[model samples]
Target: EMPQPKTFGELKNLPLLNTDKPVQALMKIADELGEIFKFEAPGRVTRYLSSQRLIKEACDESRFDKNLSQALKFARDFAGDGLVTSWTHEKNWKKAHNILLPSFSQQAMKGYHAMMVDIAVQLVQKWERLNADEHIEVSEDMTRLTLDTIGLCGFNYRFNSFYRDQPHPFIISMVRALDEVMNKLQRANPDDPAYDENKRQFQEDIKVMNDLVDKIIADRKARGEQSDDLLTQMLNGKDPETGEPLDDGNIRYQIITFLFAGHEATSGLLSFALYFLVKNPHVLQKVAEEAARVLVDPVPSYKQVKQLKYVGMVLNEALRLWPTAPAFSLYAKEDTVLGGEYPLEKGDEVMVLIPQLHRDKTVWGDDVEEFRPERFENPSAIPQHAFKPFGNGQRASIGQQFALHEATLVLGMMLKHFDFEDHTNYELDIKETLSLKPKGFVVKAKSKKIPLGGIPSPST
Candidate 1:
């Protein structure tokens, strides 16, 4: 008898998709099957690989940039009247991406540095209230800090996440909605009993969040005054090609995307960096010395951030191990051969396993599992496409600079203000869904003093 064909639903149940450590799952798969293995289910066929050349080809503008995996884009019918929102399809992506790039230009924003520091200080204050032995879950606290940071910096809004024990309703709603959406994507059965319930709940929460964004836009318009923030820039920006403003519906998606993107990865970076630090005392001591010497103030000046070379290396090394976007999907624009090897059809999906490539033993050597910040001291030590924690080519994350600056600044401040000790007994159990974060990574803090800012300090 011939082998049976699998369904799209069936594909979701595979170990590669179901495992907590998908990268390890993918590595096993790669060992059994060649790099460019093509898989077919009822409704779709996907080409999965970590081969650098082919992965780059798929990511490059020359082949495909038209669409993201359906999972990444919100479903309109189930979600709302936001069909073909700027993030879902190429036509809208180009228009919105072009306008968004300039709006997010760090050089153009005046108060972002102070805003980031303000939020980071709020988090530090909250930590001060904790008893010496009390444990703070690293991941949860980071989400709180970054949520507030993005709110203030992205839209000039305030979530005040540190003020309350529970997250704000908006934060609660968005989290549930995204969780539900991920559930829908992961389940193998379209007719699963919880599908309807999950979909209904997702729709409700998504609409609530979208409506809140609309209110912000309206309130800004009602003021009839412009502020030098991302929201204001988007509201005023026009398409250079058409000279027409992006539609209001699309603007809401763009804002929500920024809020989601800005916080999630940066928060993970903070959590993982802390995890690595607490685990490696020698490394922590080195970073602490660097941070104390370079970041003597509670909030370092903008230029001072770049001088924290050790902090930067630590962040990069952590990201290399636990990249937030562990896998990225791209598809063929037209029928062609990939890397002068595997044949591809139009619309064929390519799954680039990022974590696997980052840890490829051939490139990173036998000590790849070890956490060593010095590995990044030499940039040329890494190959071109193999080290893309923030991705590469045209579709690389635009928030790389923002994330690195924010993470280094906030983490540096923490190093200066507290002594972190691993209080939790749990081993490193990471949860990778949308992003990689610790399952129960908790630590205790002992407070310290920090100097006031606005005084002159020599550059490193």
Candidate 2:
């Protein structure tokens, strides 16, 4: 039987509440308890679920609101004030969200597309320089590509991620800082002897992160720059009500926040998408044909990338099989019943296991284990709220369209340039700490040498 807290004070002592990897632990519990059960955590009573019907019912702002847990607050505190990720109230969050939302609009997305293609081309060229039969770590390269893409589009700055033999200094520190943050959160109980060391390392990493971003911002100011990119917009963006631009101190936070959220999800997506493509030859052939059909240019336009339906389908299927962020939660502000059955108190937490919901046999069918792009032919084929790669509702990911457009464009461009092959001798090796990522990344590629603008005719 699952343990229950007889007293509110004991909530903190609950076994489930103490685990470092909450999502992974919760999925294990859900396996035994079925979906929809009461859970007790430090600050509140909780009910975790995987039901699409329940998630949709509970996702709205009225029923529940976005609340960052204490464990997840490292990002917010490191960034300090003037952060959308840190805002607690709807009004405060909406203010920053409203000002920055336009920066990611489809028209604005078009502005970033050219830069994205440039970075992708650089990556392809870098691969071309290598021996055709030589193996490469596709995951690491994808991470570099993603970091560069966000750096360029966010600040109109370049990491030269592929241009360099090693990752940029900023990238190095940012990656370390994130790892330390995870360590600090996970090994936090203090009985562990290394807790102090982890804390010190986290602090050191955070310092390096702040200093690196400070230099980047300083260099920007020194150059007397002006542009339509995300960083420039944030630097000049003013609160409509107060008529005040964001504090200069918080500018790095904004940029770091973008890089933090933008990089991991897309990189993991790319790695898994490539893994799927290499393993499933038919899926790859179909997607390559789609890329060859819709992509009539070396660097496709945003509209052209959108028309790569099979590529989109393959990406979706990969997301379904391997979502990066395993789970996320919503905080309930008022007493309410979930799906009109499960009861909850005013201060309650509802953690949703994304991968579990994503792979729900009842929702995705018995063939869920199979990677078939045709499963997405009908939009109505899956339940309304079942697909949540970017999350659902108001607090959902603001970068969904940005990632999709960029990923599709990059994948299409790569398809035009090369055919990929998996070189690993083992099954998918995943590291499930803060996010799910490929462990040992060995993959090989062969250049397709397909002529530019030579897309085959569209299929009926």
Candidate 3:
């Protein structure tokens, strides 16, 4: 989910509720997807379960956007070892928009953003050295690096994961679990009425990560230590409205959700971004030029992230090319007609097909499949529901803003510092799992002469 839901046409038709529509009960109809997670499966439990997913998707995944944001706030991607904030104060809305959200906003944030720049250089150096001896598995390695970046930098935590001989406890298990979330989501059988409308990609991903998050909470409660990243800020965060402290359970929920959410989405986004970028080298210079413009003078200060307009467009294009969460849940409680072509009735579930939205010639033009960063330059000129890498409506990604911050920052910095050149002439494997990422890609990433931003954080 990148950028907040920007328009209302997309917002108005969003699946606000879906379990009780009756017109479909009176009739039956078609086959199609509206937007990712915009459709719902209507059954006794479809509405209720879909609502749960709604929370999981729009808010829960990102700490329920504030009710949970307070417990956690994260940028979309990181440049250094990622930190899983033990707690964050961003799960709540008011806090986010007012003060909390700004803390993670890329345009002015310092901690993770700065490190991201440094790590871009660092990753290139590491990738260069690593490429010589081993096959570069683009997605997996990027996924691993994404995790390590969060653990070490984002929240000042450590996983020491994704590498041979030194993986963390939760890291290995969580990876396996995430595999489950993706498999179910990508392969969901619409005809199986008895089947629970599953998260598909984030299923076991949530389970394993939830378990891992719980352990962290328990341990932290035992040790009485504060997380150095956002988690610590959340643990000690005070509600501006109520002035009461968040309890441990809420804190736990936010943190666990943040780690799992951040890991799955960012890993997928970055790998996909690189996959596309490596294949389309022409765009590389543009990106490089953008990065150089922003970061050329010893890189951008965290404050200038807003200036990377085309870079943001490129990342948005990548998100369109390969949406991290392609399918989402939506339920129809009222029988109403939307988009004329699609009929809404009570008890109808819609599987919001994001890929379709990105590819819709009506909205995105006939060449939807093409990788074009320039599209974002005039994103405002498009239709209301046209560009939604993040889901749409009032219930779009709560952390959509944060994801934009993270992905753009991390991606831009990386391009500025290094060059990811593809060794294989083939398309990267699109691992349709808990999250979408390049499956088994091996890139020959070489480090270029990037101006130093800062010292790299100590390796975990």
Candidate 4:
């Protein structure tokens, strides 16, 4: 039997297979309890064109992710009712994903679309360098590229952490703090008085996070720039319903949300994506064939993003095998029975585990452990509430669209630039964190086409 949890909701808030959101704790879980539990978290649907849903949803706000203006608008930007959206799948889906997507911006759509596509291009260049360079490892190179992608897409700032000689202290410190907190909590003695220490640490960690976000917001403000980017929307957005501009707190809240959501989640994506693609060479070949068929040009575009369905399969498979934000928890306001099974105790927490759910033999069948992209042909094949890489309720990860769009774009580009033949032959180290990712460097599928200064020359 699993031991009682102290904090009660950390790993329950992430992927199920991961065991813990902190690395060291993952080790402890493994030591104490062999391997990850089956049906532990939410999972991925077969042939879940997460990419297709993302594109359509971003363009059409009315679907599941509608504008707040349709109802209350800004009166309650992200509170209770708005926080829940069964309109789609999860209650948090609408709130988290909808915040960045403009429910009304076709005019800005062109620019936004261009900006979104530009993200892939920027990544193409980054990976190109990794492929071109000889010494780079898959781990370092992919993480760098992921960071670069988020920097450009979310904030229009392309950081070269992968290529840079020095790492950012702020980023390092923040990650360390969060990781420590998560790890300790998992291995911590349940008998110990966990209340005061954890709460104090959480406060300190938030300050660290807020400090970085504050700097970013201040920098953004000074730049006085707004180019249909997600950062601008969150920081200075006019709640579609209220028309009231976002305040400092609002901007900071949202930026920090993405700061964690964007980088950590996307990085996990890059790591897991590489791990799977390397193993599934056939899938890689199919993706290459599709990208060649769709992207008949020097650079891939937004339209190209739509046509890469097979590439979408590759990403779906990756997420299914290794969802970053796997499981999520919901608090019951009052007593209620759910599905006539688990009785909803008054403060009971409903935890969804994607890793365990995805790996469930019942859902994926005998091929549960294998990596196959074709399973996406019928999404419903996977049971509801069982298959959710991006939480099922209203408050799941906010950047589901951003991650899918960007992932599809990267997959296509990777297929074009280099053959992933070498990297596909190695044992992967799954690292647990806020997002599940490859722990160490992947063997062969390293970043290619290295660039000087991590950017193109002004002339070029």
Which TM-score value belongs to model 4?
0.69
Error of 1 at 113 (Å): 0.8
Models 1 onward score TM values of 0.89, 0.89, 0.67, 0.69
Cα lDDT, model 1, residue 131:
64
User: What is the Cα-based lDDT of residue 439 in candidate 2?
Assistant: 71
List candidate 4 segments past 4 Å from native.
1-135, 187-212, 240-243, 339-341, 380-383, 445-460
Q: Give the TM-score of candidate 3.
A: 0.67
Q: Where does candidate 2 have its weakest 10-residue lDDT segment?
A: 451-460
For candidate 3, the C-alpha RMSD (Å) to the true structure equals: 10.6
Model 1: weakest 10-residue lDDT segment is 77-86
Candidate 3, which segments miss by more than 4 Å at Cα?
Answer: 1-108, 117-121, 131-135, 162-167, 181-229, 238-244, 297-300, 340-343, 449-460
lDDT of 4 at 277: 69
lDDT string for model 1 (365-412, tens) is: 878789999999988877767688876565778778888888998898
lDDT of 3 at 123: 50
lDDT of each: 0.73, 0.73, 0.53, 0.54
Looking at model 1, the pairs that clash are 7-42
Number of backbone-clashing residue pairs for each candidate, in the order shown: 1, 0, 65, 43
Candidates 1 and 3: which is better by lDDT?
1
lDDT, model 4, position 326: 55
Write model 2 residue lDDT over 1-460, tens digit each, in one string: 3333333455453555345555666676666666576765454466667767777876777878766654467666565544436645634455566668889897899898888887887777777668646787877898899988998888777778776778777777667766666655444365677567766766777787778678778767786885578877777778787677666666667777887788888988888888888889888888888888887766688789889888888888888877887667788879887776667777777777787787677888888778887888897867787888776576778888888887888888878777777765547877665577777767777777554434421110
Better of 2 and 4 by lDDT: 2
